[PDB]
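CORE FACILITY INTAKE
Project code: CF-77B
Contact: R.S. (postdoc)
Sample description: multi-component assembly, two entities in total
Requested service: structural model of the whole complex
Turnaround: standard
Below are the sequence entries exactly as provided by the requester. Do not edit them.
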Amino acid sequence: LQHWKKCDSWWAKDSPLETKMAVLALLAKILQIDSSVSFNTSHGSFPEVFTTYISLLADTKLDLHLKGQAVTLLPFFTSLTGGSLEELRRVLEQLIVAHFPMQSREFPPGTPRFNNYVDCMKKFLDALELSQSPMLLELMTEVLCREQQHVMEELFQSSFRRIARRGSCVTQVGLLESVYEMFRKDDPRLSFTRQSFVDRSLLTLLWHCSLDALREFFSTIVVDAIDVLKSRFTKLNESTFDTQITKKMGYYKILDVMYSRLPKDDVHAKESKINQVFHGSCITEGNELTKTLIKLCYDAFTENMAGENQLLERRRLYHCAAYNCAISVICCVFNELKFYQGFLFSEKPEKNLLIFENLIDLKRRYNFPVEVRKKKYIEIRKEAREAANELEMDELNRHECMAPLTALVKHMHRSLPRDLPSWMKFLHGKLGNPIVPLNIRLFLAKLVINTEEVFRPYAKHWLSPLLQLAASENNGGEGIHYMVVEIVATILSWTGLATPTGVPKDEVLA
Amino acid sequence: EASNQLINHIEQFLDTNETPYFMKSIDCIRAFREEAIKFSEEQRFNNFLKALQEKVEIKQLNHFWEIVVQDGITLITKEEASGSSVTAEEAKKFLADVDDLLDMI
């Protein structure tokens, strides 16, 4: 590190292209061989090798597959202080805005550009997997979220999963505050861009493995969410309207994820959570922010739209995210005798206060193909003859409400002969009625199909609506078979009980 | 076809808020400026310029409009046609029940 001036025909312009890679190899071995000493406060010949490191990846002469073997030694630098960090980010952004595809994978694959594109991006994530820098993450979460599925979304998710559990708590909070601050600011842009950050990145960061008790990002969000939520809606222009909805549903999703994987003590005991939302040591028991969010959460989906047609598809996502938040919070609170019916089903429609008619589509047709196993059919034949004489997402099961619904239904099974209150009888009033529209009946149909093991002992009530839906002709298609196959499969496998003969309308339906 | 392609590219480039993209987009409009001057396609020149002027009025594009008004992106300059020798005088004259359960938690 004392004779670097002797080799300046190498890393210059109008030099052969391979000697620059020789310089890169020398810098790699020398940096790896001693210590982390050539990174701060001008220890050795520090500003004379930093200029080599800058000009080797700032120049517009090397190739894209060659600057990857420069970007691979990023962890040796990204722990230093300010100053030249702006120069580093400036040459990085000058690389990205000039030698990437324009918006999102605008290139036919196999061509000699997608090759170098994945070559560079895999090395960026190679560096980011160990050098957990709260600088490099923002260099790529803005090239990602101009779309939905880059080409390699699973690479990004695997790397963020690898990042999230590392140890050293005091930089993960920096990652979280950095993405929440780049999501929270004004900087006016599209709702897809403004949503996909806390749809992908922060969600997989809080989801995968952060800590069981990482209450720091809990602490810096409490009086940050509810001031946004407890607002008005100014319906002048759509361009403020959609980002109002987007920040509100983002805060809903955030509170959902942090309420779900957090125990009852540090949310609802006399601790510094209620003592965080209120001022110091008060005499409250556990319920200061809970009722405050729950009243606006109940006000969210129970909201008629009898004269509004401006942007309603987004309010569908708003309402179902609200219902998701409600599920998660009544999960992670007291879990008493019966609150779920009154808080998630007690629709009083005399003033147009209903639930399902807002949060499902009632415009999109569900296709339900033919089929395109036999041991299942053979086995049910043998056992039914003896007695007598995860989930697959095709179209209906990925509708962003099914999995928490089945989760709370299983909870109500293993948590506590007339009937069950409202979470079954309300549905039987809305499934055994030929006045409810089609998609709600298909919704509750596949809900009972995925929860067939818990509506088993009430099949003497749950016989007519399933069979009526499978036989009555409004289901579209050819009289769809991918639903009636599973309906008759469950309705004949829970035999022994349910007595399928004995009512005349039941007989004519059969 | 490719003209519409770069039209969509400069719309998304001005929609995003990166500061080098402002100079990149002014490079794109200065490329299509000489292209629609020297290809004898003045109708596309003035019609696209009126449409993008309507777009920059209805949006803000504030700092990009600042580099425009220090750069100059205006209509057809010369005679509202393809042939004359008129300077930027046109440019500078156009731009001078359930309530019980809430407390029961």
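Facility notes:
- Residues 130 and 163 of chain A are 7 Å apart (CA to CA).
- The radius of gyration of chain A is 29 Å.
Invoice: internal transfer
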